[PDB]
Ligand binder design. Structure first.
Ligand code: HEM
Length: 400
């Protein structure tokens, strides 16, 4: 299961961390990853797991490597070594595609969409409220971002379960479809819509993308489908799992819950602190050349894991980093990434989070983990929560 150690890697830097099955997973996934920040662990280590790769363990190195795109390329952005979404793997071109994507998910769009997002959150919460229980992950978290995508992209509600099935197959295959088959089925769906909206545009994301320009010429169908596909999948598992870590914490910490109930104006700040504490993405890069990085010889072609999750957990970045404190004066994190690939959806995501917390806490202020339940986490490129059974007394809630 361990790949043989390359001869350029000194043995004293070896730490066999498995990003898909870390040793202390039962104790919490962020805690399991923070073992990389224990004092006997160097800033940059090599693991023999998963093909063999570097891991930067501290925020300083994680940020620097994401800044240095000339050495740390997105050509292979995932460990381990058919994925073709745009602009994940791409500078003049990356910048043009990002600008176009920014027209459709940037702050002005999110500000226009906010009340629609609230209305959606409200309808979902109200549907669960009288039951006095739900699996938050399945019953609220999963249906919310996919519905926001349909709003954003001007797609009919009827198309949700099929689209959701394809995106589920790309990350959590049941075996009916290979990744490549799921991706192509997604493209089968998007291509006709892109073409129709090229000729007869609305103001939705697909119309805007389909009418965009790259290199002084019209965006191609291939480019537009790959961009639309990324806009869809980028906002699903990340938001599902993040909302689930946040709601798990709030269920388990009545005093933090009470703080937001009493002081709802703190919710935007609380969102930032939760993004830091329950950070969840760990992407990577591949070396474009031999490069000495902080005293360590990296070889052309080596992969390096640069966990976005770790920057904000680094005690060099935030004191007492496992403590949640909504009043931190400086919330330092790279939860949405860093450098040229910084999350295009960061504004939409924050609004989704804040709206969800505001609406949940006003309708269902008092809730707990279901008696007897033990919450299980999962680890990967996007770490997450397997299920989140919550319980409340319906008499303590308030209807619309
Ligand atoms: C809490 C929720 C989210 C988190 C934690 C998150 C995290 C990230 C991170 C870390 C990256 C950079 C990956 C890298 O550098 O390799 C990224 C990129 C991206 N995200 Fe998000 N994301 C979230 C929500 C969203 C949403 C809601 C959307 C779309 C509506 C979205 C779309 C994208 C896209 C299109 C990129 C690629 C940007 C590029 O390559 O230039 N994300 N995200």
């Amino acid at each position: 299961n361990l790949a043989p150690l390359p001869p350029h890697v000194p043995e004293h830097l070896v730490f066999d961390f498995d990003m898909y099955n870390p040793s202390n997973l039962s104790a919490g996934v962020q805690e399991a990853w923070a073992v990389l920040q224990e004092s006997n662990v160097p800033d940059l280590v090599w693991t023999r797991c998963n093909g063999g790769h570097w891991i930067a363990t501290r925020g300083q190195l994680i940020r620097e490597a994401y800044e240095d795109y000339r050495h740390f390329s997105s050509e292979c952005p995932f460990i381990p070594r058919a994925y073709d979404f745009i602009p994940t793997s791409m500078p003049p071109e990356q910048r043009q595609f990002r600008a176009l994507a920014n027209q459709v998910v940037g702050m002005p769009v999110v500000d226009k969409l906010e009340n629609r997002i609230q209305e959606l959150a409200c309808s979902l919460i109200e549907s669960l409220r009288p039951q006095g229980q739900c699996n938050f992950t399945e019953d609220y978290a999963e249906p919310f971002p996919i519905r926001i995508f349909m709003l954003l992209a001007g797609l009919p509600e009827e198309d949700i379960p099929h689209l959701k099935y394809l995106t589920d197959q790309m990350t959590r295959p049941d075996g009916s479809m290979t990744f490549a088959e799921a991706k192509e089925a997604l493209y089968d769906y998007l291509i006709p819509i892109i073409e129709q909206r090229r000729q007869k545009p609305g103001t939705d994301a697909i119309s805007i993308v389909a009418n965009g320009q790259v290199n002084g010429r019209p965006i191609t169908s291939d480019e537009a489908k790959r961009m639309c596909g990324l806009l869809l999948v980028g906002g699903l598992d990340t938001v599902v799992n993040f909302l689930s870590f946040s709601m798990e914490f709030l269920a388990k910490s009545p005093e933090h819950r009470q703080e937001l109930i009493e002081r709802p104006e703190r919710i935007p700040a609380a969102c930032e602190e939760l993004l830091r504490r329950f950070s969840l993405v760990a992407d990577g890069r591949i070396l474009t050349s031999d490069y000495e990085f902080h005293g360590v010889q990296l070889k052309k072609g080596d992969q390096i894991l640069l966990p976005q999750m770790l920057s904000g957990l680094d005690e060099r970045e935030n004191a007492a980093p496992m403590h949640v404190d909504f009043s931190r004066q400086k919330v330092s994190h790279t939860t949405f990434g860093h450098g040229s690939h910084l999350c295009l959806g960061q504004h939409l995501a924050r609004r989704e989070i804040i709206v969800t917390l505001k609406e949940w806490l006003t309708r269902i202020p008092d809730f707990s983990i279901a008696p007897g339940a033990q919450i299980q986490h999962k680890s990967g490129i996007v770490s997450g929560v397997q299920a989140l059974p919550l319980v409340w007394d319906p008499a303590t809630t308030k209807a619309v």
